[PDB]
Amino acid sequence: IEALPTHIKAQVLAEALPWLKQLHGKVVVVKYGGNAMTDDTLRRAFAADMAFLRNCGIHPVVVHGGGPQITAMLRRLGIEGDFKGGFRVTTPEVLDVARMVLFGQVGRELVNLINAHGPYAVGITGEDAQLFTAVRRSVTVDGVATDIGLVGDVDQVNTAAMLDLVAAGRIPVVSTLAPDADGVVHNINADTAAAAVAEALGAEKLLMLTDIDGLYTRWPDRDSLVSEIDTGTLAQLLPTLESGMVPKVEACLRAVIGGVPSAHIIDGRVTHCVLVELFTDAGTGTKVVRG
Amino acid sequence: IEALPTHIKAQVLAEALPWLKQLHGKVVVVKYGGNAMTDDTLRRAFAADMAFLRNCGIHPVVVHGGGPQITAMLRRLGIEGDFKGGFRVTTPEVLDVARMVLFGQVGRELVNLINAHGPYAVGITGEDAQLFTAVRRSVTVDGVATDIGLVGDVDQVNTAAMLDLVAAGRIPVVSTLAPDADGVVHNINADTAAAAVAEALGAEKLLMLTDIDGLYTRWPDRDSLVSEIDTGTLAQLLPTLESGMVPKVEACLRAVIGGVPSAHIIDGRVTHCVLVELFTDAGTGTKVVRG
Amino acid sequence: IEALPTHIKAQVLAEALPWLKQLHGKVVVVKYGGNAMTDDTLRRAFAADMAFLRNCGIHPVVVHGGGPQITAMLRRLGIEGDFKGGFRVTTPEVLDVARMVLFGQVGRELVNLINAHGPYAVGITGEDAQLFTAVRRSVTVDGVATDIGLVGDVDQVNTAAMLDLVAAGRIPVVSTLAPDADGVVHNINADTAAAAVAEALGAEKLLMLTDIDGLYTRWPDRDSLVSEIDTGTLAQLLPTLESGMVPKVEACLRAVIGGVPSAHIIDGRVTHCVLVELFTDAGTGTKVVRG
Amino acid sequence: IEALPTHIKAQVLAEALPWLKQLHGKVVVVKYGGNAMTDDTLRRAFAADMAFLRNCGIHPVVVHGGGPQITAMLRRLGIEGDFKGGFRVTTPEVLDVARMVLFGQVGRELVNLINAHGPYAVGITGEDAQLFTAVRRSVTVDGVATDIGLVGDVDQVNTAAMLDLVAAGRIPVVSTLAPDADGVVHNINADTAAAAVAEALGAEKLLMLTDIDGLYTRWPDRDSLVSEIDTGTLAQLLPTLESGMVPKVEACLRAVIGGVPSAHIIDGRVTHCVLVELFTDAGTGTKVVRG
Amino acid sequence: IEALPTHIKAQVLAEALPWLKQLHGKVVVVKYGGNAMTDDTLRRAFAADMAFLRNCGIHPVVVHGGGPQITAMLRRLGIEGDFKGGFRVTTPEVLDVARMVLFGQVGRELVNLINAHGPYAVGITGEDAQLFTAVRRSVTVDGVATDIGLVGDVDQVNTAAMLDLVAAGRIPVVSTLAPDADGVVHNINADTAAAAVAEALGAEKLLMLTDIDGLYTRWPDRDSLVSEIDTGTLAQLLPTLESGMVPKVEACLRAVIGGVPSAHIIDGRVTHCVLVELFTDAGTGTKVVRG
Amino acid sequence: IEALPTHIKAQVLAEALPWLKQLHGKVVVVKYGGNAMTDDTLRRAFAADMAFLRNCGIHPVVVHGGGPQITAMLRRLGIEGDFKGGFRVTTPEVLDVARMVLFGQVGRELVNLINAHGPYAVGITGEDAQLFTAVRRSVTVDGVATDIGLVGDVDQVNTAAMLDLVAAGRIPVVSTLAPDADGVVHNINADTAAAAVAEALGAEKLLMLTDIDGLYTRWPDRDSLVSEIDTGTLAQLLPTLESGMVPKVEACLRAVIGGVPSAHIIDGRVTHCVLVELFTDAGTGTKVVRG
Ligand SMILES: N#Cc1c[nH]c2ccccc12
Ligand SMILES: N#Cc1c[nH]c2ccccc12
Ligand SMILES: N#Cc1c[nH]c2ccccc12
């Protein structure tokens, strides 16, 4: 990284300035999962980027997933699953495991990585300070939508308390569990919870780290990768995409329709993807705006 | 509770007033473990008492343990232990389990119980916002003090950040894990961590919930239960007590010598023990002051 | 008070918690007169209860009367009265006496009693900082309503200045005198002034200390004492009650219709009546709500 | 006042500017008694001057007396006095009268006069919010100093609470009564209480309204009126002056020695004496500084 | 100024009080030019009056002109002018000169004069902190309105930033230059800029220092000088006045129609004209109100 | 700038993070002159870098020179100079010119350039709000140090007011003129004024833009350019350097000895020199630390 002439290091730094202005003082929600979360080099870069944002006076909020880690813990504990469609039923037992893996293991790693740069990160769920609630969701399994246990969608968000915590300079690292109106804690899909947090906080950008270059119109035609797309066009192509992309795309729609200026699907396999998507025009992600 | 004449309900309420004045605006650290934590009726009463304090403008801080729950999880996961003396060696594997049980299971239950009364509780470890650090401790096993893995004593405490969180009206529920100066997370004995938090925050009282009526000079002589005792006298009798009481008593000494006006050993088997110790002179606990 | 088992002292304390939550941070206006004001034991209990409220983060405002003390001072000064109906005409001379007795004697005693518990109470009239104004009221004497001198109803209240003084932690002790729009000070009936203060400050409760168990439908039928009643029903029975109860009931109507959630007529002959009405369900008072 | 050329109205206004700068944002304690308090034209001018100060961002504090009004009330009430030396013994009965006359009559008139210009004045004694305490004083009667009842000197002053009330824009009008360390209210000489308030608040000036042109070295030699004098010189001539001037001069000494930059003895028989002493060099008063 | 009896110095000071109340805490914009700006004695008096206002808790804002000083500098620099009608075309060269004379010479003198009394004045243009913008204005020259270069009218004003600077206790001294929406700096007529600042800041008064006794209906009939006039009447006589008075009168109309309670045309040849217009009823100026 | 692989744009951005942390919330004083100030491309880059810093929550303070522009204006005005040694005597006439060129021309250009990115810059001298004072300096001309008119060194700095203006988010652009203790304005060398501002504000870095690669031990030996040097070593080589470097080096010594962690001499001929010196390790400047 040293053979690079310094007059060019200068220019890439200077070229960040219009995005520094656009995001100064603003909320950016980042959904973090996939290989950016399981590879050690990408993890440390991700944590360093959160520290970066925060040392620019930008206000990151991290929502994390952890599907595979829950599955591994359930097998270690010998807890046999029930499955309707392709969905595990989350019994009270499974939720306790989900909660202790998400909040007590996965969240901790990111909190510690970020905090290597300063006292920034703090972990939380909807349970803490009543920051958000859940409502039980059913799923559609080849016809009759059905019940699959303590699985929810975000209900209400304590917008005021959340922004107080951010204005105080903290980086909330959110584990997606929250109580319903009766105090019963549900597990919430992390992609959609990111969308709901972004909308409630008036975020400027939703960033969705995913394990793909970006959105493909006609996968796997290479000459079909899009750079930008509107929600209306993104509605009419939703029924066509691979299973893995549906939650990430529904999140971007639910956010951008909800007033978030842009949602982005970026590649988490790229080192410092966040820095390149926010401060560079050479990003590989795809940007969703309204229309 | 209705056959009680109302002129007497009045008097017990009025008799709380001098302790309301003494504790208004003040920090009270409560170590919470034992049967007050495992029995459902005592749990709900404990949570309701934390809500009480907080609706009197008193500032509770809860430090919780969970030794037995860690042990059960380790057996469920089939993780065989190593033991020096009577101490389990906490390998990196054991700490990950300890942390996920303490923060992701035991802390969650108390947060949810308290939050049934309002948005008060928030869970945290030393990892969050760098609130406190640990330093590795060795243990003395019948002679040569020795190493037993990632087990620590509290090092430094971010007093300012902690009191900000309390002045904001929150009830921190602390899980005793914290990073050392190198970012490596240790498990801290909860009794001694309570003592260190109390001293750092300038608490007015340390409350230590324990499964005994109180301190016995000469157990099991009944006519030996003390009501109050000074630290100097409490130093010279320390080498004489049952194994279970040593950490609770060392905590009270380390706190009261450190400037906390009084530490109390109260019985957690009593419903609403906190209310009776703080707002009543008919408490069964034993109070430690300096001298 | 010591032969009472401690597990029962606990329960009556715990049973206060839902009213602590309901009133935390809220304004409670208390009209204080009668035998709770002239008996020494009831006085000290009343003052101690105001200190209690204030050490729970509740915000009491005390409005006091003093009819009989004015009369005694007038006789001591040999000032002969004029009477239309049953009403003394308050000449400029009588008002100067009323003001100096109410503010300079009766208010002082309560300020001093309360302040024995801390720097809480501060005395005031509408004259101070222009906190409220009066408008001259006429009275109805068996037909033609007529003039009886410098006697008023509360006009406007400086809501902002009043709540600043309360948020500062003070317990205003109000003597009901205020200037009209021309600077001429009037004496205001204390019961109705309490109602107007409660409505202006957005109080949660109006407490009216009176020398009776509570409201009787058909006095003196014992089996006619009510526990709760709505304003509409309380309008249609108003023309039926003893002379002494009319101002206390008109106050509760004017307050509850004005948005105060509940007004209460409680017995000031009961030691710590305030504590039992606020923090106990075994109260003897009668509660007025809208409907 | 109209035949005066306007170029000269201009100059006297401009000539106030260096005292506006000196006193902007500062505390001025004014002892107010005598004929400035009993003549209606001088009263209204005094009140208007307090409003003036306050509309210049200056912070007046008024301490008032009222000796003669107490005496008249005692005679109206037929309360016979006891006298040691020339001093009335203030029994509990006399104090109740003193307090109700000072706070409930004399203070009220000034509060109302000032408040004709805005919501500025608020009345208070040491009893309110524990603003100051008294300590019982004995007197020297031709030899053996002796006890004369509930008469005190100011003990401690709640400097913080007092300046909060002033920074809030209020003009405290102080009646000199305060409780001792046991809650027993004493009457304090107003001249000396003014001196103690001035010293406690870090006032810039003490103003002492008195019924004389100013200090005379050798009364009644006309060519003996002084314009300025230091405390050391003012100590050595104290044993020589008329009885009426001793309390006013002891006040100025106790204040200026206590750090108040200057104390002034001005003539309260002069309309707007305060304005002329503060904003004009043509004052008739006498100024005391240290040395 | 000493042969004046002191009882009369008192009365003129006391007679200022109702204007102190009216303007306490309020914004007063002062247009300053003409002989009050070029004569040394009038300059120092003007600066002293700004200090006066500020030491009364009044908030002056000074807008200054400087037409003749620009002309002299242009001749010193040998820059030949172009003239359409009677108007100099302000080329880029002329504006650089105008800006450096207005901000770098004329503004500096007033800043320094005022600051002799304290740290009050601070100089600024629309360029600083984007405090206001300009829009290019054309002029009407005996028919076809035409372009005369970089000359503007005030466009938008950063009301919030301006009042922050004033609430901080500063006296802004404004040089009328500001950028247009494209960053190109224009010179703004000072009289009309004063009117726009007054309206944007919600000033209580606009003061326009001019070199005349006041407005004459039928100049030069002496018996035609007016003391007060409404905007409607001031519209219909505008087409009749001398060239020099049109900008001063258009300013007063644009301000008073814009909600400023009164605009005043006062004589800047009078020492301390500001003090006499604000704090005296013997002013020679003419007051404009709406109607 | 597009043929650069994006994984490398990422790394140079990520490599800025440790200097973002070091300077977040801190003061950086930048002396700005020379060719970075006269070339249009370097000007716009400089202004953009100030906007950059400010959108990272860093607090730049710009001190500017302008020697050559003063000289040109003096010749345009035909003002003949007097010279002792190589120094122009600054008469009152020369200072008025210096002040109007520095504040009214050179400062304006930078204010406008920076403000193209937002409302950040505000121009000021020591005259404004009494922000700093000067003391007359003499010079040493081949022996006898002598007087050269109204030329000064910075005396006192209003540290509090200056940091208020910066905490408010403003970028002060300072023109080095200030009054002495008698109100007489002096011109201050900009290099040394930068050093004094840096020391007074507790800056983290002093940046000195100069027209050279950096400090040469033995100019013009190329193999003599230093990267870092301590003050003690920088004292003993000071008597050896070219005339142009002495003020820049004396500034760095006076700053670093005064507690500023590092002063830097960087090349203003390099586009975005500020960005490369602060956020890159490939800088060409030379850093001065204490020792
Ligand atoms: N709200 C909230 C919080 C939950 N955990 C925390 C740790 C430090 C500061 C704040 C919070
Ligand atoms: N407002 C008001 C007050 C009237 N008297 C007082 C005494 C202490 C504090 C505040 C006030
Ligand atoms: N806004 C603004 C300012 C422009 N110059 C200033 C000098 C001192 C304080 C504030 C400002």
Short mmCIF file of C-alpha atoms in Angstrom, two decimals, chain D residues 76-274:
data_model
loop_
_atom_site.label_atom_id
_atom_site.label_comp_id
_atom_site.label_asym_id
_atom_site.label_seq_id
_atom_site.Cartn_x
_atom_site.Cartn_y
_atom_site.Cartn_z
CA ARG D 76 -53.92 47.33 69.24
CA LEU D 77 -53.83 43.79 70.61
CA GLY D 78 -53.39 45.06 74.17
CA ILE D 79 -50.21 43.01 74.66
CA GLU D 80 -48.28 44.67 77.49
CA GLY D 81 -44.52 44.71 77.06
CA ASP D 82 -41.63 43.89 79.36
CA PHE D 83 -38.55 46.05 78.97
CA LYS D 84 -34.94 45.44 79.96
CA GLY D 85 -32.92 48.55 79.26
CA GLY D 86 -34.67 50.13 76.32
CA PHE D 87 -35.43 46.75 74.76
CA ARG D 88 -38.78 44.99 74.56
CA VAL D 89 -38.56 41.31 75.53
CA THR D 90 -39.86 39.33 72.58
CA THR D 91 -41.91 36.54 74.17
CA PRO D 92 -43.37 33.82 71.89
CA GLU D 93 -46.52 36.00 71.68
CA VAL D 94 -44.55 39.11 70.54
CA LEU D 95 -42.69 37.11 67.86
CA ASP D 96 -45.92 35.73 66.36
CA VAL D 97 -47.08 39.38 66.14
CA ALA D 98 -43.72 40.59 64.81
CA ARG D 99 -43.73 37.83 62.18
CA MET D 100 -47.31 38.43 61.06
CA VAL D 101 -46.77 42.22 60.85
CA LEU D 102 -43.39 41.97 59.06
CA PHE D 103 -44.21 39.16 56.65
CA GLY D 104 -47.99 39.56 56.44
CA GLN D 105 -48.35 43.32 56.24
CA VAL D 106 -45.16 45.30 55.63
CA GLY D 107 -43.60 42.84 53.14
CA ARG D 108 -46.91 42.57 51.27
CA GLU D 109 -47.08 46.30 50.57
CA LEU D 110 -43.64 46.38 48.99
CA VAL D 111 -44.29 43.16 47.02
CA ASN D 112 -47.41 44.70 45.60
CA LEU D 113 -45.83 48.01 44.79
CA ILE D 114 -42.98 46.43 42.94
CA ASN D 115 -45.22 43.98 41.19
CA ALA D 116 -47.13 46.81 39.64
CA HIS D 117 -44.26 46.87 37.17
CA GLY D 118 -44.10 43.17 36.53
CA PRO D 119 -43.81 39.75 38.11
CA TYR D 120 -40.69 40.52 40.04
CA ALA D 121 -41.06 40.51 43.79
CA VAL D 122 -41.48 37.53 46.03
CA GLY D 123 -41.62 37.62 49.77
CA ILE D 124 -39.69 35.42 52.05
CA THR D 125 -38.26 34.78 55.46
CA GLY D 126 -35.51 32.48 56.64
CA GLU D 127 -38.27 29.92 57.26
CA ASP D 128 -39.00 29.51 53.53
CA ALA D 129 -36.88 26.82 51.82
CA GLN D 130 -34.55 27.06 54.85
CA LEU D 131 -33.04 30.16 53.28
CA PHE D 132 -31.33 31.32 56.45
CA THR D 133 -31.03 30.54 60.11
CA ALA D 134 -30.77 32.67 63.23
CA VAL D 135 -28.77 32.38 66.43
CA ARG D 136 -30.11 33.90 69.66
CA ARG D 137 -28.38 37.16 70.56
CA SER D 138 -28.07 38.81 73.94
CA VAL D 139 -27.90 42.51 74.47
CA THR D 140 -25.75 44.73 76.62
CA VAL D 141 -27.77 46.87 78.97
CA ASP D 142 -25.58 49.32 80.89
CA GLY D 143 -23.33 46.50 81.97
CA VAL D 144 -24.43 42.88 82.12
CA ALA D 145 -25.38 41.79 78.63
CA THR D 146 -28.75 40.08 78.95
CA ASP D 147 -31.47 38.01 77.36
CA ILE D 148 -34.43 39.68 75.67
CA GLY D 149 -36.22 36.70 74.18
CA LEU D 150 -36.48 35.41 70.60
CA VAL D 151 -34.13 37.96 69.02
CA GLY D 152 -31.26 36.80 66.86
CA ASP D 153 -28.48 37.54 64.47
CA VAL D 154 -28.32 35.81 61.13
CA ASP D 155 -26.47 32.52 61.35
CA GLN D 156 -26.08 30.71 58.06
CA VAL D 157 -27.45 31.69 54.69
CA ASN D 158 -28.40 29.35 51.89
CA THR D 159 -26.31 31.27 49.38
CA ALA D 160 -26.98 28.80 46.54
CA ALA D 161 -30.78 28.77 46.85
CA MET D 162 -30.85 32.56 47.23
CA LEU D 163 -28.86 33.23 44.04
CA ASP D 164 -30.92 30.67 42.11
CA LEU D 165 -34.00 32.70 43.06
CA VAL D 166 -32.30 35.90 41.90
CA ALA D 167 -30.88 34.43 38.67
CA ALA D 168 -34.44 33.35 37.92
CA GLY D 169 -35.17 37.11 37.73
CA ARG D 170 -36.92 37.54 41.07
CA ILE D 171 -36.62 40.34 43.52
CA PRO D 172 -36.60 38.81 46.95
CA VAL D 173 -38.27 40.96 49.54
CA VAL D 174 -36.97 39.71 52.83
CA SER D 175 -38.68 39.81 56.19
CA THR D 176 -36.05 39.17 58.83
CA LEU D 177 -37.27 36.14 60.71
CA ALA D 178 -35.57 32.78 60.75
CA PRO D 179 -35.45 29.57 62.70
CA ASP D 180 -32.56 28.66 64.96
CA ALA D 181 -30.88 25.26 64.76
CA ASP D 182 -33.85 23.83 66.72
CA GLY D 183 -36.61 25.20 64.49
CA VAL D 184 -37.52 28.08 66.83
CA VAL D 185 -38.14 31.28 64.87
CA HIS D 186 -36.36 34.47 65.96
CA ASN D 187 -36.74 38.10 64.92
CA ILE D 188 -33.56 39.63 63.48
CA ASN D 189 -32.65 43.31 63.38
CA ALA D 190 -33.14 44.32 59.76
CA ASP D 191 -30.05 46.52 59.43
CA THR D 192 -27.68 43.77 60.53
CA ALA D 193 -29.56 41.14 58.52
CA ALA D 194 -29.02 43.28 55.42
CA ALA D 195 -25.29 43.30 56.14
CA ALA D 196 -25.22 39.51 56.52
CA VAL D 197 -27.21 38.89 53.32
CA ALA D 198 -24.95 41.28 51.38
CA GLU D 199 -21.83 39.45 52.56
CA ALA D 200 -23.24 35.97 51.90
CA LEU D 201 -24.42 36.78 48.36
CA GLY D 202 -21.21 38.53 47.28
CA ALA D 203 -23.15 41.73 46.69
CA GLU D 204 -21.43 44.58 44.90
CA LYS D 205 -23.10 47.26 47.05
CA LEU D 206 -25.02 47.49 50.31
CA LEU D 207 -27.52 50.39 50.27
CA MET D 208 -28.85 51.48 53.72
CA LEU D 209 -31.83 53.84 53.45
CA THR D 210 -31.86 56.07 56.54
CA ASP D 211 -33.60 59.32 57.53
CA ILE D 212 -30.50 61.56 57.46
CA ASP D 213 -28.43 63.34 54.81
CA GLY D 214 -25.49 61.12 55.69
CA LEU D 215 -22.81 60.52 58.27
CA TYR D 216 -21.80 63.50 60.41
CA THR D 217 -18.41 63.37 62.14
CA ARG D 218 -19.39 65.92 64.80
CA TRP D 219 -23.19 66.22 64.76
CA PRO D 220 -24.60 68.74 64.52
CA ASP D 221 -21.71 70.68 62.88
CA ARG D 222 -22.87 71.06 59.28
CA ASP D 223 -19.28 71.30 57.98
CA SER D 224 -18.74 67.72 59.30
CA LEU D 225 -20.82 65.66 56.82
CA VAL D 226 -18.44 63.13 55.15
CA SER D 227 -18.70 61.82 51.58
CA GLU D 228 -16.55 58.68 51.95
CA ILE D 229 -14.76 56.91 54.81
CA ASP D 230 -12.84 53.69 55.42
CA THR D 231 -13.74 50.97 57.92
CA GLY D 232 -10.72 51.54 60.15
CA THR D 233 -11.61 55.20 60.57
CA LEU D 234 -15.24 54.16 60.85
CA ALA D 235 -14.36 51.82 63.72
CA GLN D 236 -12.65 54.45 65.86
CA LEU D 237 -15.50 56.98 65.55
CA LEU D 238 -18.34 54.48 66.18
CA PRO D 239 -18.46 55.07 70.00
CA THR D 240 -19.35 58.74 69.37
CA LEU D 241 -22.55 58.72 67.27
CA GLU D 242 -26.26 59.11 68.01
CA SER D 243 -28.11 55.94 69.01
CA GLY D 244 -30.03 55.73 65.73
CA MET D 245 -26.91 55.59 63.56
CA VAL D 246 -25.07 52.79 65.41
CA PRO D 247 -26.95 49.85 63.77
CA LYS D 248 -26.69 51.42 60.32
CA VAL D 249 -22.90 51.93 60.77
CA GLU D 250 -22.23 48.55 62.35
CA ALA D 251 -23.98 47.07 59.33
CA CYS D 252 -21.71 48.90 56.91
CA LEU D 253 -18.61 47.76 58.82
CA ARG D 254 -19.70 44.14 59.08
CA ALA D 255 -20.44 44.17 55.34
CA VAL D 256 -17.36 45.95 54.00
CA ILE D 257 -15.01 44.03 56.27
CA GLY D 258 -16.79 40.93 54.95
CA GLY D 259 -15.75 41.72 51.38
CA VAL D 260 -18.61 43.85 50.04
CA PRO D 261 -16.83 46.51 47.91
CA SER D 262 -18.86 49.41 49.31
CA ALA D 263 -21.71 50.04 51.74
CA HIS D 264 -23.67 53.27 51.45
CA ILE D 265 -25.72 55.27 53.92
CA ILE D 266 -28.16 57.26 51.76
CA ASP D 267 -31.10 59.52 52.60
CA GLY D 268 -34.46 57.78 52.20
CA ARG D 269 -36.31 61.10 52.38
CA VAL D 270 -35.05 61.86 48.85
CA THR D 271 -37.28 60.72 45.99
CA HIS D 272 -35.51 58.00 43.98
CA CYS D 273 -32.52 58.06 46.34
CA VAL D 274 -31.49 54.65 44.97
#
